[PDB]
């Protein structure tokens, strides 16, 4: 089934691989070659996760596929000692990368720019930082995070407290600022569009004049219809990127407590006062 306007858009072309062979839709999903791959990768990784779950516990929150011991270095591990995690990592990476390449096939077919696959490549960059880049720099795949709903929260807790106060990480304070600011911007953007198209009952749908006037009335500046989506993309992508920066520098480029990092600020010759 299709949206009542969808038929005319379902044309041939836009693929990067596979050509006509996979260029079709199953229900609403466009398939493409990267959809077949993202399906094989996703099913493989999910079924491997459930196998790992069957060996410890089926409780959804307590399922955990953990990375190997640090003593393994970069070697591939036995399956039940983190080798299962490593296969799931290469399956998830492939699932993410083929998902973005597939969104690139969908982008070209609808004549859209590649903003969505690239914006997703930032999210893939952050996961790659967590499971590939940072474990590489530190020298062991065991530095990646476990695949479990509650077991990866203990990883975040302990890795954060490896630096004794992770709030003082300068790149983390920047990434948190970008995360808080982008949901603030999302609240304003979503709210303002709803406020115009859904005014008080008995009022006409308003214009982009009212949108600019509203924020110029409130804060004295309005970024506009186009600016809100550039800034919205900018804030969320910087949120992802500075997440990657904050974690890649935690351990490969800083092994002490993050509060100590601010010792350079306390020592600036301008304001030492002693």
């Amino acid at each position: 089934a299709m949206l009542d306007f969808e038929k005319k858009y379902r044309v041939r072309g836009g693929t990067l691989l596979g050509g006509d062979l996979f260029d079709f839709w199953i229900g609403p999903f466009y398939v493409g070659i990267f959809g077949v791959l993202t399906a094989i990768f996703a099913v493989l990784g999910t079924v491997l996760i459930i196998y790992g779950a069957s060996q410890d516990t089926f409780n959804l929150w307590q399922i955990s596929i953990a990375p190997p011991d640090l003593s393994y270095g970069l070697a591939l591990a036995p399956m039940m000692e983190g080798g299962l995690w490593q296969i799931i990592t290469v399956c998830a990476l492939g699932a993410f990368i083929t998902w973005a390449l597939r969104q690139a096939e969908i982008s070209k077919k609808l004549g859209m720019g590649y903003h969505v696959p690239v914006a997703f490549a930032v999210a893939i960059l952050a996961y790659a930082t967590l499971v590939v880049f940072r474990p590489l720099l530190m020298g062991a795949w065991g530095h990646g995070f476990p695949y479990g709903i509650l077991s990866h929260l203990d990883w975040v807790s302990n890795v954060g407290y490896q630096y004794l106060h992770f709030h003082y990480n300068p790149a983390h304070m920047l990434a948190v600022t970008f995360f808080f600011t982008t949901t603030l911007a999302l609240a304003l953007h979503g709210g303002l569009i709803l406020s115009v198209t859904n005014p008080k009952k008995g009022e006409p749908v308003k214009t982009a004049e009212h949108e600019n006037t509203f924020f110029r009335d409130v804060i004295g500046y309005s970024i506009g219809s186009l600016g809100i989506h550039r800034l919205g993309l900018f804030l969320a992508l910087n949120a992802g990127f500075w997440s990657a920066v904050c974690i890649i520098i935690s351990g490969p480029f800083w092994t002490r407590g993050w509060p100590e990092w601010w010792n350079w600020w306390l020592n600036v010759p301008i304001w030492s006062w002693g």
Binding site: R12, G13, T15, L110, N212
Partner: protein
């Protein structure tokens, strides 16, 4: 366990607060998915998707809400999904043939997909009445009538660093194949959005110098060497860009005709764009 919050030997207040939020989150998710089904619904199940070989309508889950009335500024209560758009889409005879009869097979255009509105060249059925501002002015108008706008946000930047505050008037336009399509004669601005939207050009390079054509700004790469490079379509293809009904106004429909034509170039402008990398 014991203490403040215990509701039974196992249940506590935080846990039941959580399940209370689960019920709300579901009702919100269902509500949000219904708001999702006010454009393009009900789904058109074609005959070649169903074992009974009859076209049908699928509501999906959750089913779409009742029609929604947007009262408009000019005094016109429009209903969503709009009846005229649905009626246009279901009755339009596409100039394309499915590459296979089964459901999900892509359409392969028969004639010229760019002028026939196939795929990335497609247009929606929109209003033919040109938009107005809240005050009644013409919303999208060229700078020759919208004379209160001058090109260049900063006069000093436009005068001393014109590269970053350009004025594309008089610029040559090149297509994806590097050929010269013509010269930019005017800029169209949205009085509400306070932005350029179209670069009107003549066809002095590939047609009549007296002909006028609109180039959407998001398809134009205004360079630093007084040349505007359009990657969407070949220079020879600027001649078939849809013309305005009136030389000084554009309806929302013609915006979908013009941006649609350039968007179609992304696949059909030159051979091989449809073809994969490998």
């Amino acid at each position: 366990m014991e203490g403040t919050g215990a509701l039974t030997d196992y249940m506590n207040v935080a846990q039941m607060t959580l399940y209370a939020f689960w019920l709300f989150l579901a009702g919100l998710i269902v509500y949000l998915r219904m708001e999702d089904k006010r454009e393009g619904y009900p789904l058109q199940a074609e005959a070649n998707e169903n074992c009974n070989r009859t076209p049908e309508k699928k509501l999906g889950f959750p089913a779409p809400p009742s029609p929604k009335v947007f009262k408009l500024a000019d005094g016109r209560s429009i209903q969503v999904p709009r009846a005229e758009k649905t009626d246009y889409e279901l009755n339009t005879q596409l100039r394309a043939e499915p590459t296979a009869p089964w459901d999900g097979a892509p359409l392969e255009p028969t004639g010229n997909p760019m002028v026939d509105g196939l795929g990335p060249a497609a247009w929606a059925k929109r209003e033919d009445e040109p938009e107005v501002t809240h005050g009644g002015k013409q919303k999208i108008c060229p700078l020759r009538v919208a004379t209160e706008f001058e090109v260049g946000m900063s006069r000093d930047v436009a005068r001393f660093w014109p590269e970053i505050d350009p004025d594309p008037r008089g610029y040559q336009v090149l297509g994806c194949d590097g050929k010269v399509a013509g010269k930019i004669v005017d800029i169209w601005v949205d009085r509400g959005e306070l932005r350029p939207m179209y670069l009107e050009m003549d066809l002095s390079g590939v047609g009549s110098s007296g002909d006028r054509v609109l180039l959407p700004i998001n398809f134009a790469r205004v360079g630093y060497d007084s040349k505007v490079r359009v990657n969407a379509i070949t220079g020879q293809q600027f001649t078939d860009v849809p013309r305005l009904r009136e030389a000084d106004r554009i309806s929302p429909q013609e915006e979908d005709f013009i941006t649609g034509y350039f968007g179609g170039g992304v696949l059909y402008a030159v051979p091989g764009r449809t073809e994969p990398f490998l």
